[PDB]
Design a protein around this ligand. Structure first.
Ligand SMILES: CCCCCCCCC[C@@H](O)CC(=O)N[C@H]1[C@H](O)[C@@H](CO)O[C@H](OP(=O)(O)OP(=O)(O)OC[C@H]2O[C@@H](n3ccc(=O)[nH]c3=O)[C@H](O)[C@@H]2O)[C@@H]1NC(C)=O
Ligand SMILES: CCCCCCCCC[C@@H](O)CC(=O)N[C@H]1[C@H](O)[C@@H](CO)O[C@H](OP(=O)(O)OP(=O)(O)OC[C@H]2O[C@@H](n3ccc(=O)[nH]c3=O)[C@H](O)[C@@H]2O)[C@@H]1NC(C)=O
Ligand SMILES: CCCCCCCCC[C@@H](O)CC(=O)N[C@H]1[C@H](O)[C@@H](CO)O[C@H](OP(=O)(O)OP(=O)(O)OC[C@H]2O[C@@H](n3ccc(=O)[nH]c3=O)[C@H](O)[C@@H]2O)[C@@H]1NC(C)=O
Lengths: 259, 259, 259
């Protein structure tokens, strides 16, 4: 329940009694911080921030700061929604939404390495890793268990599928498909994120069905449109594969070129 | 006119009366800060810094710090010259000059996104954008309205032309030509920065003349030297095109290869 | 001998009397800082940190922070060993070891530019340069006089040889061989780091023997295995060349592909 005396916390900020705030941190008004959340030193939590339970914010992390959008109205009250059990490492930088009804949303059990960045209006699910120095532009969506490696940049309006991986230094300009590994500049889909599926304990049967789905899509000499139709006409598919199909059809920017 | 009590500001620092300095910021001696400039928390403004009007320095921004030059004499009094209406985002990092008569110069209406870096002796004009995590080496020159995307690195002694764009993750080793888009590792000129010229309200006539100039240079099967001569012998050219020609001739490192 | 009043330093921390600690810095218990070491503002030195003589830690540098390893036990007492005459620039980030008997080790006369990162269990020798925004993963080893340029990422378990260079933006996934230059994504060995060998004052005879060694390895139409055997059967070799041979044989991940 210990808070450092040299912390500047607004009277109105709704901090749970268990919460810890370190030296020279600054918490603004219109802030909710729930149970078990530990804040270190020099952390800034900006107005609009709704932080859940058992999160950690390491030194210099900056939460709910202004959108890096030159057309954004700074007098607006916009939000940063953060779930439970997230870790924000040193100088990680999370920006709030650009509209009253579009917050920046982070789920549970995500890990933001030092100096990593989440732009305005990003939506992240659960158990994601954003590695050191990686930057998401505004309006980037991650599903669950995505691994984004160091110094990656993700273009605005891209989706990153569940259990996908993006290697160091990759320039992502289109969607990263589920269960897949993306790499390079220009980046391409390399193949399956097998290591991630195994780590996640996917049965060999599911992993093979995911493999067959992408064999059809990417390794059968037919267009993506025809490949998706073939998969469906094939009969009853597992939900992972239905998810792959949906992901391809709903894609806004399109899906990263295959290598 | 409000300054936070926990700020360490040198008595000699020349701050205007309107200026605002946030919690735990450190301003040194030999600092001039003009009217309307707002400084947030944990900002450091180093000796030699001449800051203009209506600038903003977000949390943790570091201004006029020592050159990352191992041969530089730290006892020297060198400057960081910053104009009006500039925005320096969280943990952005601006380094001072390496000589008494060569300051680091930033003009007006520039935007430095979080964790972006301007090396010693850089010269930047007006209305430029330095996107998140981007780094300019020492002695980098930007004109006006250059857009430099996220996690770009620019080599020392490169020039970046007006209304040019550099995409994520590009490794810039030679000049970025005016009105052009550069991308990749190794980077190349992709084509015209049409989006930027339109946004800037260039007439179709000017945009087409810029297009014709580069068609000759890059798309007519002739050497750059011959292409520039052809353009001039063509008669009276618009000033944008004369600027393109001058930019190519005055280039020190040469101009980025075309794709 | 001057320490700022607003610094939070643990009573148990073993700081030499000459040491300087700037405003709003935080030093923890179980910290040794030797003679002549200057710390600026907002620097954090974490438990386990053994800092030598005449080092400098610029504003916001974070030393001995927790490993970015999700399987690491945070209750463990692990170390960060730093030698003499090192410079850590603004917001540079050094992480401690993951085991009691495996510290993170930095030698002497190294330079860590702003926002550069050394992951858990890295071993660095002397006179190395880690340029702005560059990131080393955990278990990265650098020898002596390695120059690592801006925004480079180095994969876990890679070795970087003496007097080697890695250009901006390079994605390093295998070893960087001694006296060599590595570049790109995917990165390759470009050739010899001649500039670095000359700067270091290598005689033309040694530089030529290094050149001949790599000519055999990389420019004689024979496998690396055969090339190394040929070099040895050639007779008495200089120690630089023996070092090249050893480096290739002892390599864990293998050595970066040649261009
Ligand atoms: C181009 C290199 C970029 C380097 C960036 C360094 C950032 C700083 C990081 C450091 O500070 C902290 C420290 O580095 N953290 C890492 C730590 O060093 C490492 C221990 O060595 O454990 C993990 O690395 P992991 O690679 O996840 O486990 P491992 O090495 O056993 O797996 C080997 C291969 O598995 C593939 N793979 C893994 C997962 C997956 O889902 N799919 C997949 O194929 C990957 O491509 C990888 O090449 C930690 N997480 C991270 C994010 O690094
Ligand atoms: C490889 C991806 C790198 C991602 C790096 C993210 C950094 C963090 C950024 C976030 O935090 C904040 C947040 O991302 N800021 C951006 C914000 O998200 C976005 C709203 O979505 O508005 C702008 O993006 P813009 O791309 O300028 O406008 P828009 O998306 O409508 O234009 C589409 C295309 O126009 C081309 N183009 C644009 C200008 C030009 O002159 N020429 C040109 O061709 C570009 O190549 C681009 O692909 C904001 N500025 C910036 C710098 O991102
Ligand atoms: C892709 C560009 C990446 C830019 C990243 C900028 C980071 C911020 C940096 C700034 O803030 C601070 C500021 O930039 N620091 C640099 C400073 O600007 C510069 C003065 O201009 O002096 C040095 O640059 P150096 O390149 O070492 O000396 P020089 O320019 O005379 O050598 C030219 C060529 O030598 C080759 N070479 C050099 C050494 C070697 O061993 N082998 C080798 O071949 C390199 O590939 C290089 O292209 C300083 N060190 C650094 C690390 O930049």
């Amino acid at each position: 329940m210990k808070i450092h005396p040299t912390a500047i916390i607004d009277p109105k900020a709704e901090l749970h009694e268990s919460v810890e705030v370190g030296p020279y941190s600054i918490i603004e008004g219109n802030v909710s911080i729930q149970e078990g959340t530990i804040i270190e030193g020099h952390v800034k939590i900006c107005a609009g921030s709704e932080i859940g339970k058992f999160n950690r914010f390491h030194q210099g992390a900056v939460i709910g700061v202004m959108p890096q959008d030159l057309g954004f109205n700074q007098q607006l009250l916009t939000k940063t929604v953060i779930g439970d059990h997230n870790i924000f490492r040193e100088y990680s930088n999370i920006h709030k939404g650009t509209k009253e009804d579009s917050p920046t949303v982070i789920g549970n059990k995500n890990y933001f390495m030092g100096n990593s960045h989440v732009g305005h209006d990003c939506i992240l699910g659960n158990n994601n890793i954003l590695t050191h120095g990686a930057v998401l532009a505004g309006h980037v969506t991650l599903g669950n268990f995505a691994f984004i490696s160091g110094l990656v940049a993700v273009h605005q309006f891209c989706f990153v599928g569940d259990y996908s991986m993006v290697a160091g230094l990759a320039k992502v300009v289109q969607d990263v498909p589920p269960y897949s590994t993306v790499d390079g500049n220009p980046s391409t889909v390399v193949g399956l994120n097998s290591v991630g599926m195994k780590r996640a304990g996917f049965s060999p049967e599911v992993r093979n069905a995911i493999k067959h789905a992408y064999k059809v899509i990417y390794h059968s000499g037919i267009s993506t449109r025809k490949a998706l139709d073939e998969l469906e006409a094939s009969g009853n598919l597992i939900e992972q594969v239905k998810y792959i199909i949906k992901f391809f059809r709903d894609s806004d920017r399109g899906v990263t070129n295959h290598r």
